[PDB]
Design a protein around this ligand. Structure first.
Ligand SMILES: *[C@@H]1O[C@H](CO)[C@@H](O[C@@H]2O[C@H](CO)[C@@H](O[C@@H]3O[C@H](CO)[C@@H](O)[C@H](O)[C@@H]3O[C@@H]3OC[C@@H](O)[C@H](O)[C@H]3O)[C@H](O)[C@H]2NC(C)=O)[C@H](O)[C@H]1NC(C)=O
Length: 246
């Protein structure tokens, strides 16, 4: 399992945890040096357990799906909470089994629904190590709308961080001060599937993408990725979603 403590968590320690998270996700193949995630895994082996501890030591165990690095549910106290979705429901059969009670959050684990439930778009939610510390705390005492928001933060500071080197930096800078994500950051999160598929379809088309993916760079304006030489590919995206799960 991979663990992380916000107590005296400078940009380095975090960087190390994100490395551990990446190294925990198994793969067999590599598409252009970028680890290609397995198309499936059966049983308990399909789940990764993160032990996050807040500045005060309070913890929670989050379950991750190693074929796509999706948050399935978590364990606070003796309770486990799972998103309201099939994969999560399947996950419960293997994780947090000695949990006294299991609760199913009234929402699904995708960004859109999580935003509707919390009442604010990701653009208006400050992320960072302090907010991660808040999120770990908010999750300790049940509150569906408080959790929807704390989950938007938890997902972006771990899952998305591991996926894009860029997003790991955005968080390390906000290690002592939160701030809403950069438009560059959102476009990336909204492209994990697109990029992954295209980087894979390029293998056999001369590193060329069958179709372009637009982004924002960070400068603040439109960008278009046309092939595997681009900065995003060569030095950003760290994990590729197996086209099979698409
Ligand atoms: C493969 O991906 C690369 C990027 O990873 C792309 O190739 C070339 O990228 C430049 C980027 O600007 C495209 O844009 C214009 O290209 C012409 C010809 O090279 C320039 O005269 C234009 O100014 C402009 O690019 C210049 O590059 C220097 C920078 O200061 C500015 O961006 C600009 O001045 C090129 O058109 C593109 N090459 C071709 C043949 O289209 C491209 O996405 C893709 N192409 C291939 C063949 O793999």
């Amino acid at each position: 399992d991979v663990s992380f403590r916000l107590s005296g968590a400078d940009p380095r320690s975090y960087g190390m945890f994100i490395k551990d998270l990446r190294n925990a996700l198994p793969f067999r193949e590599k598409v252009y040096n970028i680890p290609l995630l397995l198309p499936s895994v059966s049983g308990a082996g399909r789940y990764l357990l993160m032990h996050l501890f807040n500045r005060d030591g309070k913890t929670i165990t989050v379950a991750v799906d190693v074929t796509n690095v999706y948050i399935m549910g978590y364990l606070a106290d003796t309770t486990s909470y799972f998103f309201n979705e099939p994969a999560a429901e399947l996950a419960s059969q293997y994780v947090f089994r000695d949990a006294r009670r299991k609760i199913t959050l009234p929402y699904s684990g995708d960004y859109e629904r999580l935003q509707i439930a919390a009442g604010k778009p990701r653009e208006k939610i400050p992320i960072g190590l302090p907010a991660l510390d808040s999120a770990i705390s908010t999750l300790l005492h049940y509150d569906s709308t408080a959790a929807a928001g704390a989950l938007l933060v938890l997902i972006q500071t771990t899952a998305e961080a591991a996926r894009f080197k860029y997003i790991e930096q955005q968080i390390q800078e906000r290690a002592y001060r939160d701030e809403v994500p950069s438009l560059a950051t959102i476009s990336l999160e909204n492209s994990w599937s697109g990029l992954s598929k295209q980087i894979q379809l390029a293998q056999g088309n001369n590193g060329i993408f069958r179709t372009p993916i637009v982004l924002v760079d960070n400068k603040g304006n439109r960008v278009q990725i046309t092939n595997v030489t681009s900065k995003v590919v060569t030095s950003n995206i760290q994990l590729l979603l197996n086209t099979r799960n698409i």
